[PDB]
């Protein structure tokens, strides 16, 4: 009974590295010089059609 | 975090050589100097010597030197870059160097000198 | 705390104000508009493509009569078939906002009158300095 | 069909290669020009 | 100019090592000919014709 | 900081900046795992068997 791994007859596999991790940290993306960023500050909103706020 | 953990204390015999390793993690240990100070009753604070792990230069108080030694080992791994180890071997034990051994690590700010250690070791007694 | 006043003057801050309030602040929103291993080709692709806009923009002012002005005085008439309406309710009812949907449909003849005024303002003062 | 003043322009070379298994290869054989291979030195 | 191969290959893929793939050449399907080329008699002495003149 | 008096259509369904995202975080995760160790000589024969159970 003699087996191999599942990945051999398609990719060369890669290892994680150890050292990094995949924890999330929070992006926050930002706009740049001659742009702007609109949030809609409404409650009840389906994200779609007019945002009053 | 910034850890140093020594060996357990030791009884010596005059005459013999003592090895104290201080195993240090939590930074990249090519970049800081450690600093081995002892601590005598009746006698206060006395420094030893200083070892710079980057490549092993040391300097050694001049009234110690033909009696200390100080050597490293590093880590050569890309996975743990962190830790290392560094050594003193104390030699030419008389009944007057039972004391405590600290080694020190200076602190990371911008106007931090070498001397202002700011972590230290646990300690480690020697009793000859 | 903060005031409504402060975040007035803010950036984009009178957006929904009449447009007569609205050309109190002009500098914030003309402020806000230049400065703010292969991500720096994207944010240097970025940059350029705002300096460079800010420069066609500080061009189009330049090729008419102002150059750092920012109100400008100028020398057509307005057409009112472009936009049929009094003064008085422009300047106190709409937002720019509003404004320019109601301009859009009329726009690049305006700039081009603008530049023809141009045009005849500096070959009439180069005759006027010419006979004296 | 061989006559000994033609000279092929293809010939039929079989070789080892490996496989997807480090440990193991196969006999496998192509098709090559004249002009890409040459003669190392019967067999 | 019509350029022309008149052999009949056939491809076969042969794996090198994972996600690798080597394209050799199988077997030749029909007459083991000699690619070659044409051109027209009339039109290439009309324009050799030319570029003498 | 508030803006008032304004009725901006939002729509998050033909929204970008989600396309560009998830365009950046498969690029910058394939951008985390090209210092790291190929599993190409791992590819191999295992003889495997049952764990202790
Ligand atoms: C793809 O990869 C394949 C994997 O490697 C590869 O296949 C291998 O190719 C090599 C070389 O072509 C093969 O070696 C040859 O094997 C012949 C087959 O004999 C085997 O099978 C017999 C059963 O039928 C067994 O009995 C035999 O074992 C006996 O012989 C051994 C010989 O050393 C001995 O040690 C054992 O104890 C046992 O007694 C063996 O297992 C084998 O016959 C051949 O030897 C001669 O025979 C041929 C005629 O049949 C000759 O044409 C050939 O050239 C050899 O001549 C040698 O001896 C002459 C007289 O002394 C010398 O003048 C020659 O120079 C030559 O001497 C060379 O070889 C000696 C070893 O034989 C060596 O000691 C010398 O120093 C000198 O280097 C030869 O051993 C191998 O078996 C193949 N393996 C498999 C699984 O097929 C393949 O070639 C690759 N390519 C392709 C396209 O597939
Ligand atoms: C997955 O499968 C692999 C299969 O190879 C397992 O690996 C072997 O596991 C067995 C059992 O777990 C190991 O056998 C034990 O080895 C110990 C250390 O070996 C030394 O001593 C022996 C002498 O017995 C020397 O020959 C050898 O060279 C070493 O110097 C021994 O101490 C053990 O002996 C004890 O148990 C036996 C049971 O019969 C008693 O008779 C003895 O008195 C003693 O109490 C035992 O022999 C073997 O070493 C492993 N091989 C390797 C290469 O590691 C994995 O353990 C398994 N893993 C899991 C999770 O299931
Ligand atoms: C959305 O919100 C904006 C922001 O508040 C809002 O605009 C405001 O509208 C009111 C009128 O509806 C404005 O009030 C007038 O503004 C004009 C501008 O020149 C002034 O001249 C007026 O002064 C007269 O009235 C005074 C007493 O009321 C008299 O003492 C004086 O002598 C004048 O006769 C008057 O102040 C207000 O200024 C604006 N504000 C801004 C920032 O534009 C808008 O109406 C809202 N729209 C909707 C649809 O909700
Ligand atoms: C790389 O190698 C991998 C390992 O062999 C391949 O993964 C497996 O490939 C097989 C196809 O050979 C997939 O299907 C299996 O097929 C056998 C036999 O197929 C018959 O039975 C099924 C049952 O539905 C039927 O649909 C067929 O028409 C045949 O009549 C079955 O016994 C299995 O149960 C299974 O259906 C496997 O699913 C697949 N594994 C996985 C995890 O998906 C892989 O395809 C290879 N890739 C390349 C590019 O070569
Ligand atoms: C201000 O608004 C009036 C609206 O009455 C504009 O007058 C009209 O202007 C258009 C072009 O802008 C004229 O159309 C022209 O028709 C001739 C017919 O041959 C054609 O050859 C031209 O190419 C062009 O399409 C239109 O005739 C004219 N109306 C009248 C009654 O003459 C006026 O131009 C506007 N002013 C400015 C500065 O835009
Ligand atoms: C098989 O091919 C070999 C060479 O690939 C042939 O050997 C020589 O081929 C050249 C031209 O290809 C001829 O000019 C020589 O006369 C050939 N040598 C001999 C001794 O005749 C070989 O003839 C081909 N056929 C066979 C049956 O081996
Ligand atoms: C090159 O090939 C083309 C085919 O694509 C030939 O063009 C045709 O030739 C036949 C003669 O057998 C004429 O009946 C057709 O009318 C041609 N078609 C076109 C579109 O021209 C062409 O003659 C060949 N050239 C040479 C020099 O042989
Ligand atoms: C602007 O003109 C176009 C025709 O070119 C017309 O369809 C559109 O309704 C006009 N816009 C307004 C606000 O009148």
Redesign the pocket.
């Known amino acids: 009974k003699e087996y191999r791994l599942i990945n051999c007859n398609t990719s060369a596999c890669t290892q994680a590295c150890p050292k990094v991790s995949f924890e999330p940290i929070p992006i926050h993306y930002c706009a740049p010089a001659g742009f702007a960023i609109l949030k809609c500050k409404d409650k009840k909103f389906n994200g779609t059609g007019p945002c009053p706020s | 975090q910034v850890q140093l953990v020594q060996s357990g204390a030791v009884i010596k015999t005059p005459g013999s050589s003592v090895k104290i390793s201080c195993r240090a993690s939590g930074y990249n240990f090519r970049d800081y100097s450690i600093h081995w100070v002892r601590l005598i009753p009746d006698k206060g604070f006395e420094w030893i010597g200083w070892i710079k792990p980057l490549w092993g230069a040391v300097s050694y108080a001049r009234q110690l030197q033909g009696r200390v030694s100080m050597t490293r080992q590093l880590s050569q791994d890309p996975d743990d870059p962190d830790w290392g180890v560094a050594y003193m071997e104390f030699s030419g034990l008389t009944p007057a160097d039972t004391a405590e051994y600290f080694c020190v690590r200076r602190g990371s700010c911008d106007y931090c000198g070498d001397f202002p250690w700011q972590y230290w070791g646990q300690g480690t007694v020697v009793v000859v | 705390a903060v005031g409504i006043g402060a975040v007035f003057l803010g950036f984009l801050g009178a957006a929904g104000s009449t447009m007569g309030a609205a050309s109190m602040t002009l500098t914030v929103q003309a402020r806000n508009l230049l400065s703010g291993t292969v991500w720096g080709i994207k944010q240097l692709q970025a940059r350029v493509l705002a300096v460079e806009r800010y420069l066609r923009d500080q061009q189009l002012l330049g090729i008419w009569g102002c150059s750092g002005k920012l109100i400008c005085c100028t020398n057509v008439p307005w057409n009112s078939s472009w936009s049929n309406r009094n003064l008085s309710e422009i300047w106190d009812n709409m937002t720019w906002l509003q404004w320019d949907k109601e301009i859009s449909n009329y726009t690049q003849i305006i700039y081009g009158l603008l530049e023809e005024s141009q045009n005849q303002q500096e070959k009439n003062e180069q005759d006027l300095l010419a006979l004296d | 069909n061989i006559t000994d003043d033609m000279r092929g322009e293809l010939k039929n070379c ?3 290669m490996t496989t997807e298994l480090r440990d193991k ?1 196969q ?1 496998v054989y192509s098709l090559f020009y004249r002009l890409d291979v040459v003669q190392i030195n019967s ?1 | 100019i019509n350029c022309t191969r008149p052999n009949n290959n056939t491809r076969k893929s042969i794996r090198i090592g994972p996600g690798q793939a080597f394209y050799a050449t199988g077997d030749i399907i029909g007459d083991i000919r000699q690619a070659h080329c044409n051109v027209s008699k009339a039109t290439w002495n009309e324009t050799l014709g030319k570029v003498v003149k | 900081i508030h803006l008032e008096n304004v009725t901006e259509e939002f729509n998050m369904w033909k929204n970008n900046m989600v396309e560009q995202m998830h365009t950046d975080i498969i690029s910058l995760w394939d951008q985390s795992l090209k210092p790291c160790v190929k599993l190409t000589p791992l590819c191999v024969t295992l003889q495997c068997t049952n764990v202790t159970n």
Do not use: A, H, I, P
């Open positions: 079989s070789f080892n290869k006999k067999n």
